[PDB]
Amino acid sequence: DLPKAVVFLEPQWYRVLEKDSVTLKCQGAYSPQSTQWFHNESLISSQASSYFIDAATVDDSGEYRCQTQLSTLSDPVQLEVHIGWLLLQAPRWVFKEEDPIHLRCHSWKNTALHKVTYLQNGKGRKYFHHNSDFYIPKATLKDSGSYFCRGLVGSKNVSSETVQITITQ
Amino acid sequence: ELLGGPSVFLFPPKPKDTLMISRTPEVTCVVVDVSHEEPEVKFNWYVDGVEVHNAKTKPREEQYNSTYRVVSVLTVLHQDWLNGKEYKCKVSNDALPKPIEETISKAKGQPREPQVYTLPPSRCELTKNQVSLSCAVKGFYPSDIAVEWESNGQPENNYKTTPPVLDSDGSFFLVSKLTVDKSRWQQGNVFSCSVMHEALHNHYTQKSLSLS
Amino acid sequence: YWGPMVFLFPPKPKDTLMISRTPEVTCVVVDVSDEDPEVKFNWYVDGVEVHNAKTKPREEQYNATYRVVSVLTVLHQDWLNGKEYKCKVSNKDLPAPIEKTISKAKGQPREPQVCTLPPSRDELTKNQVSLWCLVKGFYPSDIAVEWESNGQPENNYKTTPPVLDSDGSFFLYSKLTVDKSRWQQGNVFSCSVMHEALHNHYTQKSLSLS
Ligand SMILES: *[C@@H]1O[C@H](CO[C@H]2O[C@@H](C)[C@@H](O)[C@@H](O)[C@@H]2O)[C@@H](O[C@@H]2O[C@H](CO)[C@@H](O[C@@H]3O[C@H](CO[C@H]4O[C@H](CO)[C@@H](O)[C@H](O)[C@@H]4O[C@@H]4O[C@H](CO)[C@@H](O[C@@H]5O[C@H](CO)[C@H](O)[C@H](O)[C@H]5O)[C@H](O)[C@H]4NC(C)=O)[C@@H](O)[C@H](O[C@H]4O[C@H](CO)[C@@H](O)[C@H](O)[C@@H]4O[C@@H]4O[C@H](CO)[C@@H](O)[C@H](O)[C@H]4NC(C)=O)[C@@H]3O)[C@H](O)[C@H]2NC(C)=O)[C@H](O)[C@H]1NC(C)=O
Ligand SMILES: *[C@@H]1O[C@H](CO[C@H]2O[C@@H](C)[C@@H](O)[C@@H](O)[C@@H]2O)[C@@H](O[C@@H]2O[C@H](CO)[C@@H](O[C@@H]3O[C@H](CO[C@H]4O[C@H](CO)[C@@H](O)[C@H](O)[C@@H]4O[C@@H]4O[C@H](CO)[C@@H](O[C@@H]5O[C@H](CO)[C@H](O)[C@H](O)[C@H]5O)[C@H](O)[C@H]4NC(C)=O)[C@@H](O)[C@H](O[C@H]4O[C@H](CO)[C@@H](O)[C@H](O)[C@@H]4O[C@@H]4O[C@H](CO)[C@@H](O)[C@H](O)[C@H]4NC(C)=O)[C@@H]3O)[C@H](O)[C@H]2NC(C)=O)[C@H](O)[C@H]1NC(C)=O
Ligand SMILES: *[C@@H]1O[C@H](CO)[C@@H](O[C@@H]2O[C@H](CO)[C@@H](O[C@@H]3O[C@H](CO[C@H]4O[C@H](CO)[C@@H](O)[C@H](O)[C@@H]4O)[C@@H](O)[C@H](O[C@H]4O[C@H](CO)[C@@H](O)[C@H](O)[C@@H]4O)[C@@H]3O)[C@H](O)[C@H]2NC(C)=O)[C@H](O)[C@H]1NC(C)=O
Numbered sequence: 230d231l232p233k234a235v236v237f238l239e240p241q242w243y244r245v246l247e248k249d250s251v252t253l254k255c256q257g258a259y260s261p262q263s264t265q266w267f268h269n270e271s272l273i274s275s276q277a278s279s280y281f282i283d284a285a286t287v288d289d290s291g292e293y294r295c296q297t298q299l300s301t302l303s304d305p306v307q308l309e310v311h312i313g314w315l316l317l318q319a320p321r322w323v324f325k326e327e328d329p330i331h332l333r334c335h336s337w338k339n340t341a342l343h344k345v346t347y348l349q350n351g352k353g354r355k356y357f358h359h360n361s362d363f364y365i366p367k368a369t370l371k372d373s374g375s376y377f378c379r380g381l382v383g384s385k386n387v388s389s390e391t392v393q394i395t396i397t398q
Numbered sequence: 399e400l401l402g403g404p405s406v407f408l409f410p411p412k413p414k415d416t417l418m419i420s421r422t423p424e425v426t427c428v429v430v431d432v433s434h435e436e437p438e439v440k441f442n443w444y445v446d447g448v449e450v451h452n453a454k455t456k457p458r459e460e461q462y463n464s465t466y467r468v469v470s471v472l473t474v475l476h477q478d479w480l481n482g483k484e485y486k487c488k489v490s491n492d493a494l495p496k497p498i499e500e501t502i503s504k505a506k507g508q509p510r511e512p513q514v515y516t517l518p519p520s521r522c523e524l525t526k527n528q529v530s531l532s533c534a535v536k537g538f539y540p541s542d543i544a545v546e547w548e549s550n551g552q553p554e555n556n557y558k559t560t561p562p563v564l565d566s567d568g569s570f571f572l573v574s575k576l577t578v579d580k581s582r583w584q585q586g587n588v589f590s591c592s593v594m595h596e597a598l599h600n601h602y603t604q605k606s607l608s609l610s
Numbered sequence: 611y612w613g614p615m616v617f618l619f620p621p622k623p624k625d626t627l628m629i630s631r632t633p634e635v636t637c638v639v640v641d642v643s644d645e646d647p648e649v650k651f652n653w654y655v656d657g658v659e660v661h662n663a664k665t666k667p668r669e670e671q672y673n674a675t676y677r678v679v680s681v682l683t684v685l686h687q688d689w690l691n692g693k694e695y696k697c698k699v700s701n702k703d704l705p706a707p708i709e710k711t712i713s714k715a716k717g718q719p720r721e722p723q724v725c726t727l728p729p730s731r732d733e734l735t736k737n738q739v740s741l742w743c744l745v746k747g748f749y750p751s752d753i754a755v756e757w758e759s760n761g762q763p764e765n766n767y768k769t770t771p772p773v774l775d776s777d778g779s780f781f782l783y784s785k786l787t788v789d790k791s792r793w794q795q796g797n798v799f800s801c802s803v804m805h806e807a808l809h810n811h812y813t814q815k816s817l818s819l820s
């Protein structure tokens with residue numbers, strides 16, 4: 230009868246750093262709608278279609294659900310607010326063979342980061358002078374494993390937590 | 399333009415301070431690159447992960463690269479440093495995403511007792527007006543060691559000690575060279591070489607040397 | 611800011627002193643990106659350009675960076691006479707080329723004194739004995755110390771780095787570990803030193819159980 234509402238993230242990253250901005254949008258019916266937001270399964274007084282987080286704190290973590298008047302309650306969406314200098318972000322972490330793998334090494338407060346290295350299982354894969362996205366056009370099974378990025382913020386040597394990338398056949 | 403915010407460096411106590419019970423061994427936490435805009439720096443100290451509150455903070459000093467430098471000092475217990483306790487300096491500042499932690503400990507590995515030998519002047523100095531006395535200290539681990547010279551109770555002023563050198567077995571060796579006038583050597587004067595290390599009995603040893 | 615860093619290294623003391631050997635000055639370019647083009651080198655011995663430098667191609671490192679190494683062969687006396695050596699690192703998308711310069715340490719050259727020390731009696735009653743060589747009163751710190759038995763190279767030795775003495779000159783200690791039996795046989799061990807302030811850049815000192 231009624232469409233199942235869907236929570237989208239803008240930007241798409243479900244893992245963020247403190248102080249980043251996250252906009253949560255609610256897709257109920259396609260025609261632009263009384264919107265209702267949930268965080269940690271309790272209502273937020275925000276009735277707008279978008280729920281804007283200006284600067285993320287650790288409390289912004291948890292499940293998120295939305296419901297418009299012309300839609301059914303949405304599936305939950307997790308949000309992880311991390312504390313640190315660097316976070317390795319990706320659209321997804323599960324890749325089919327020959328799919329593109331596109332990663333970014335995001336810095337806290339968008340601090341200029343230079344001499345960036347992306348590492349797989351302890352070995353470096355790619356080095357840039359300035360911060361740049363890591364990109365593999367065609368995924369193989371050898372591209373599977375544990376990934377983290379590092380670099381210099383000014384003179385300080387900083388690194389992100391490792392994330393696991395798997396390649397399915 | 400201090401993009402990274404302040405950075406932290408943690409220094410160990412001086413070898414001699416940990417060995418003599420009458421001395422005061424200190425662990426030093428130096429914080430550099432503190433910005434004028436965000437100068438407030440908070441220190442937290444942990445001994446084996448347990449917070450202590452007896453640290454002294456020295457006041458902030460301006461540097462010529464227009465940045466601040468703050469030093470915190472913690473006096474450690476002699477036995478605790480020697481037994482391999484970890485000392486953690488935790489530093490807070492608003493230019494950082496989270497407090498920065500540093501950790502120091504006495505070098506891991508089994509301690510080895512040094513061997514001390516004295517070596518009379520070489521044949522090369524028979525014509526020279528002054529002579530070199532050598533103090534070979536070898537087979538010690540870790541490199542934390544101190545060496546001094548004395549004659550008739552009075553400490554000798556004219557000596558240089560080579561840095562610890564890694565030997566083939568993993569232990570360290572060094573040599574201390576005392577320079578004295580030949581005439582003092584002609585006379586049956588006794589010079590002594592005092593060596594301090596954690597693996598020595600009572601943290602002390604002394605070897606003497608004379609024209610016998 | 612460009613990215614890659616440049617380091618210039620001096621030749622090994624032995625190479626500069628032994629006439630049969632080849633002393634080299636090495637220019638290393640680290641942190642070369644894959645997106646960097648071809649790195650070009652220009653060498654200058656007192657402003658004057660030379661073109662005898664064999665430059666190795668870019669080499670991939672374990673951290674995904676690249677390393678370009680350029681080696682120049684230098685004349686023995688050129689280095690000793692205190693000549694300036696420039697390395698010019700140039701790239702297609704580089705605003706100003708990086709220039710690095712090194713030369714032999716300046717100051718009054720002082721001849722080393724070689725002093726052999728027999729093993730301590732208080733060590734003579736152990737499995738292996740150690741022989742000592744006090745090399746002192748030399749400037750600059752650039753030196754090479756070696757051991758031989760009856761004129762043939764001995765391996766089992768360790769040397770302290772040069773230490774600054776009260777008079778401004780340097781000294782060091784070399785320890786050679788030998789089997790007590792080889793010392794008892796009356797074999798002639800010798801401590802050989804190479805330094806710029808020595809005649810023929812070489813001297814030697816005998817040591818044996820008399
Ligand atoms: C702005 O200016 C700041 C300083 O002022 C400068 O201004 C000008 C005038 C200029 O000309 C300078 O000369 C002047 O200093 C400047 O701050 C500096 O930042 C540097 C980093 O950017 C720091 O470099 C580090 O140095 C460490 C060693 O420091 C000692 O030695 C140097 C001389 O070599 C000396 O200058 C220092 O003061 C320091 O001396 C020691 O001081 C302690 C404590 O004060 C003494 O302890 C004694 O203790 C007894 C107790 O019994 C007693 O209480 C005494 O009173 C007490 O003094 C020591 O005796 C004394 N030692 C000596 C020999 O004198 C290095 O260890 C360190 O290396 C580490 O980091 C490197 C990367 O940065 C890395 O390459 C290296 O591998 C190493 O990495 C570490 O490795 C460890 C394992 O081995 C790991 O566990 C670590 O995690 C790891 N760390 C990291 C980060 O990776 C480093 O090179 C410099 O110390 C500091 N200077 C001062 C004075 O604070 C600032 O950078 C400037 N800013 C800008 C933007 O330019
Ligand atoms: C990625 O990883 C890179 C390497 O990682 C590994 O990669 C593997 C594949 C494999 O290659 C591994 O081996 C390797 O570990 C890494 O590159 C590194 O970058 C560092 C900087 O970020 C460099 O540090 C510098 O080191 C200089 C000394 O380096 C020697 O010693 C180290 C070991 O400690 C060694 O690794 C080096 O290769 C080098 O060894 C010497 O090499 C020369 C030339 O090949 C040899 O000489 C020649 O020998 C041949 C015979 O073979 C022949 O006889 C020739 O005649 C002769 O010339 C030597 O034999 C050999 N010696 C030894 C003992 O081994 C330091 O001088 C330098 O210090 C200066 O700069 C620092 C700041 O950057 C500063 O802290 C310091 O105070 C000093 O400061 C100033 O520097 C200025 C210039 O910048 C000068 O103008 C000033 O004078 C000076 N001021 C003062 C007061 O001193 C520095 O620390 C490191 O060399 C380099 N390693 C290699 C292997 O290239 C890279 O960073 C990584 N990238 C990323 C993004 O993470
Ligand atoms: C930011 O901070 C990190 C430090 O955490 C830096 O990364 C380190 O970089 C140094 C180089 O400066 C690395 O040191 C080198 O590690 C190499 C690792 O080899 C691996 O693979 C082989 C298998 O082929 C294994 O044997 C080995 O166990 C390792 O798993 C070594 O090959 C290097 O050895 C060289 O030097 C030694 C001298 O003792 C020689 O004996 C060797 O012949 C050889 O020449 C060297 O030790 C270090 O490992 C890095 N650490 C990490 C965690 O990555 C960054 O560079 C720094 N800066 C930036 C801008 O990111």
Ligand SMILES: *[C@@H]1O[C@H](CO)[C@@H](O[C@@H]2O[C@H](CO)[C@@H](O)[C@H](O)[C@H]2NC(C)=O)[C@H](O)[C@H]1NC(C)=O
Binds near residue numbers: 268287292309
């Ligand atoms: C919503 O729930 C999450 C738990 O999923 C809360 O996040 C935790 O917050 C505490 C500090 O308050 C941290 O120690 C935890 O690490 C956080 N958990 C995770 C998984 O990151 C969050 O605080 C809750 N927010 C509200 C408004 O109720």
